Symmetry: D2
Subunit: 403 residues, 4 copies
């Protein structure tokens, strides 16, 4: 299929068919009027310049704003790239350079990018890593805490301790803490299934890092910029200021711009952004702030969560409803007690939806990924929610078949 | 300093000062009317979309065009990124995947990017590699042929054989040819000093690769899209069709878009581009074709070469004039016979120029990098050339001092 | 201190003080009469020869014997080195070469050697890895099953499933099974604390390997040659034939000789031994066979286990008694219920023992390592056991202080 | 074939056929009476002991002697292994640990061992590296100076400058000098063809290392212990004290013992030897000293060199005669002016010799390796030399055919 154009949460194919976008670099929705104008005004003045002798204003303005909105009060610096991948690659460099150490710890289930560094940190789609090794050396992966498929009787405190214990094992065997430059964590894993780490777990890792001189880095490529109902996913957690943070194309409404924002002394251990993409980004941040999208995601998120929890009541194929902001994973299982994945039911849901004007896809075969643009109007949100309920019903009753 | 706007080969700072741009993602010049309009028209329809269920038209059109204009007649496929760095990273993957081998050979003096893969292939600025290792494994660097500082009495044939002999040594010691996935070469090194490899040398390497099943890959990030007076720098060489080729932001007039273009069977061994940047790229290629910029670079290049060779006659500090298209390296030496670098004279030249409205910079301390936009009007080209002649004179007579 | 000489399980310092050896390349005891004579007879004929045109007989004889006694019935080949380290390094090569794959999986807690390959596989003493990285690429570590410090209520089946689940996580995230050349496991970890893997766990890993084309390799450097009461530690497990197996200096009574013994087709994927050390090894194997040391270790092992389990009854500082053959780990804890390690009590035990003519040391601060020579006479075994009981008493009553 | 026994420079197969040994861990010859007795006396007292609480005397004595005889006057420490491979692996660790840097530079043509570290440093037989990668990261290879196949008109000074220039290129491109822990060099390459580096070349590299804080390490596994007519091959060079040096099994007459001997402060940056092998080594060093083998190799070496240079006069297939001590490479070429290798003539020479009771082999197809035991009696040396002359004649006249 072929998309012609889009606006807000609506996609329009070449034959004029309309769909509701449930899928992300689209926090502010498609073709926001302010972003369009920023791109157009800025292309008229300056598409590109090699930075040697000169600076541009959108760049310096954007840079100053991101330093401020970044989590915590410690002074920051900002380094621009073109995508998540190259930002996460840079995090490795910044961390190594600053600490003089070489190991990096990253999580199983994570997705950090497709360049050799960020790919090596990743733990999602090995297909991505097949036949392309060796990868970057001195990287270790540890398991990300899973709150759904747990052991019988486990509290959140059990799950936090158990996983923090897995975290330490490498450090108790072959990986010297004093030679680890940083830990990189998605405060909520996206490609992993919209899996959020328990609060205590994160405090343990954080305290561990500080106690052994290891930088604490986060990836907010998918979960930042209001997606969770706070500005930054890490703000779902109590009093945590990371040393380094990555941001992706969401920054510029899907135009290719990225950043790393870090504590000044870390960033001095070792560039400037596309001006048209910087324009788009200033407009984008303005829309998030003035349209109150952080708050909107929180409020609609809580709404969505209730709507999904109620659908779950009539629809046992819904194993788990996870939602923080308009950010959710609706995990389908063949049976509530075994939690067996039902990739087949999920495929059926998205094809039904698709067929009724709702665009959505999955993670890990069986989890629906719900991340509509934050600007989504309540009417469309409700249409889409209804179509989904319907989809569950059709599938429940065997009324859905994929060609 | 701060740039406000630019058009063609003219930069304009915030105080309305004008400069002539001698510096590259600017083949078609600044703010070309067609590129501006493509960006603006396309932002109105679609800034970004996640590609899952949908394709966009600019993407498919761009893709088809690049398949065709790419060097050789073998069917091609095209894979899009956001920059040179991530394209060169991909070249590694594509090569490995296809061949099932792991080693990669790259050249000393090269610059391929700043992500961990392309950075590891690079051989220019170790500063870039300081404190950030380990780099990517299974990469070997070999020396790039230097035609200026050669041994007494050396012909182009001597230089070609000598360097091809260095090339083979690894293969005769620790690097098994049958385990090398590819060789990546800039047909003319850019960051290296605008150093072009001798024709015979390139045939040797090429034939070597084919004879041992090694993919032959080129980087045209800096030297492609008409910069040399042919479409692709590799076209300066007789009957060479690479297996893989990288292209950078020049593709979209400095908007963040890249590509790898390769033989179909290689590319099947293992994405889609930003639509606004794809729009910019279609406009950009159209300008190169209809404005005859390939031919223009050839013709102005030959003009520039004569103008520099004549300046050299009155200015012995000019050791070497290298030029293929409007693509040149004007290498300054303290003495014609010793060839000692004179980084100091070069710094003085650029500061004089700067002060007389000409923006230019250096490579390796002492080489002037001449790569103005291809659309440069002859009047400005001549102004800039004159200012340079002047600069040589001032510096010759000790009239130039840096604060 | 300085040792002058030794015989059986007795060490004698330069001042004629006698000690009982509880510490291993000493399966057959010190200075066995047959080993001494083999060394002496063979030194008279041939200390060393470069193998080019010639073979030696001890070498071919030793080779044929080890092929036969190795676990399983599949034809084998034997490749000789000088130590465990270089045998485990070779296992990596053999595995890679044969499979055409690159990743290797090894266990946390393991000790495989001190050369860069075997060191990278290791998971015991990071001190060993401090400041010497980067290590060898494409190695992943997983946790070795711990049967003592487990979760409340865990059966052996829980522990087996839980740990096999940790094993799979890498394979479910970033490590492609089809690109893993082998898994290397100590059927009982030695440096790790004399920790034996549960039977079901091992069947799972084994079946996993076979199902994904991964070679199953074992380290018997510490636990082979009758140490466990079977010839090979892997024989404690039902019907398991490894693809590769490493053996260390025990082979030649601590003379420097090692081997890898593997399935013929694996070993053809890609040397010969010191003749004097091969002589020592033939004598050594003869002593193990005719003196019935496999059986002796089993019988004395069961005796030792009862004697330790009874000491545990009066000595609660003994948290865990682990023993398979004359191969044991007597783990000291500050409290039976918390299992807190008591490194301090252990240090006190060995100093008491030492002072009463018993040489023994620890693993992980708090575990006594019991591995006397297999030939140990029952009288000495009993003396040493008694001294230990005493040591526990002294320490219990605060009668022991380290200078 | 099968060797039964040997003594001095004589090998004896199982059928009582005698051969003269021209091939090395055999500096003192086969079965020297003193070495045999040391092995036998020491096996009677102590074959092996785990070093924890105890030291042995042969170990401390050997250690003290090697500290003293090592090149230079700076205090030294000695660390023992079982072979060249594991000594060269350790050199990497020692160097890294001390400097806090990670890169290592090693030479094309070199052979340092077969464990993953020393193998990665090696540059001789890629077969050894086929299908076993990835190798150890952060290693770079540079070319070893070749004095035979040089460019027309080159002096030793040209060859020294040219090669030192190749040495620097990496450092001028991608390899930061301040991040290189050491350079490891064979002062005369053995497996490479008995190729000795020019004096000036070595001073340049040495001075380079000192000027950039890089440790200067040498391999004397093949060329040490009097092989060159000085104790250590590095003593062929003016006033050079290495930071680290490796020694192999020659130390103990082919018993498995190795060492690293280094400047004390380097060695403190981060074991003990087999007592029977340490005994053999003390005897071995005594034989070298009292039998004047350093001097003998010098004198016989000069004799051998004249005898080969004269054979060359009647035998043009001898391209190059290289000899320093009883250490030589007699390189066969198809034509004196082209220097084409004649692997075929070499194979014929060794088969003729073999057939007339002389054991010798080749390097690189066409170079005869001459390294008889140093104790060789002049009568046998002369027999063997004569047989070789004969061999050249037979081959010259087409009288030699391999089955």
């Amino acid at each position: 299929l072929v998309i012609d154009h889009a606006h807000g949460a609506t996609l329009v194919d070449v034959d004029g068919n309309k769909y509701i976008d449930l899928l992300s670099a689209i926090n502010v929705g498609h073709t926001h009027e302010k972003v369009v104008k920023a791109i157009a005004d800025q292309a008229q003045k300056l598409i590109h310049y090699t930075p040697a002798y000169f600076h541009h204003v959108p760049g310096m303005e954007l840079s100053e704003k991101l330093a401020k909105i970044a989590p915590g009060n410690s002074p920051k610096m900002v380094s621009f790239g073109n995508s998540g991948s190259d930002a996460n690659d840079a995090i490795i460099k910044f961390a190594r350079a600053y600490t003089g150490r070489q190991y990096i710890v990253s999580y199983m289930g994570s997705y950090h990018g497709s360049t050799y560094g960020s790919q090596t940190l990743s733990g999602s789609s090995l297909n991505m890593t097949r036949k392309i090794g060796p990868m970057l050396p001195s990287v270790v992966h540890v398991p990300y805490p899973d709150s759904y498929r747990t052991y019988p009787g486990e509290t959140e405190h059990d799950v936090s301790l158990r996983y923090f214990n897995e975290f330490k094992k490498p450090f108790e065997s072959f990986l010297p803490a004093d030679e680890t430059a940083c830990v990189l964590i998605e405060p909520i894993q996206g490609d992993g299934g919209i899996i959020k780490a328990p609060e205590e777990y994160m405090q343990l890792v954080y305290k561990f890092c500080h106690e052994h001189g290891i930088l604490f880095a986060i990836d907010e490529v998918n979960q930042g910029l209001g997606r969770t109902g706070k500005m930054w996913a890490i703000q779902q957690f109590k009093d945590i200021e990371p040393d380094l943070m990555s941001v992706g194309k969401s920054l510029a409404s899907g135009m290719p711009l990225s950043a790393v924002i870090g504590k000044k002394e870390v960033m001095q251990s070792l560039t400037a952004g596309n001006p048209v993409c910087s324009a788009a980004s200033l407009a984008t941040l303005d829309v998030i702030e003035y349209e109150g999208l952080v708050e909107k995601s929180a409020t609609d998120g809580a709404y969505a969560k209730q709507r999904f929890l109620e659908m779950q009541q009539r629809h046992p194929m819904i194993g788990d409803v996870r939602m923080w902001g308009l950010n959710g994973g609706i995990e389908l299982v063949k049976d509530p007690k075994t939690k067996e994945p039902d990739s087949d039911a999920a495929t059926k849901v998205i094809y039904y939806a698709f067929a009724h004007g709702v665009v959505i896809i999955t993670l890990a075969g069986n989890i629906l990924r719900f991340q509509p643009p934050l600007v989504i109007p309540r009417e469309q949100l409700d249409q889409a929610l209804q179509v989904l309920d319907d989809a569950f019903t059709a599938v429940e009753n065997g009324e859905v078949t994929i060609p």
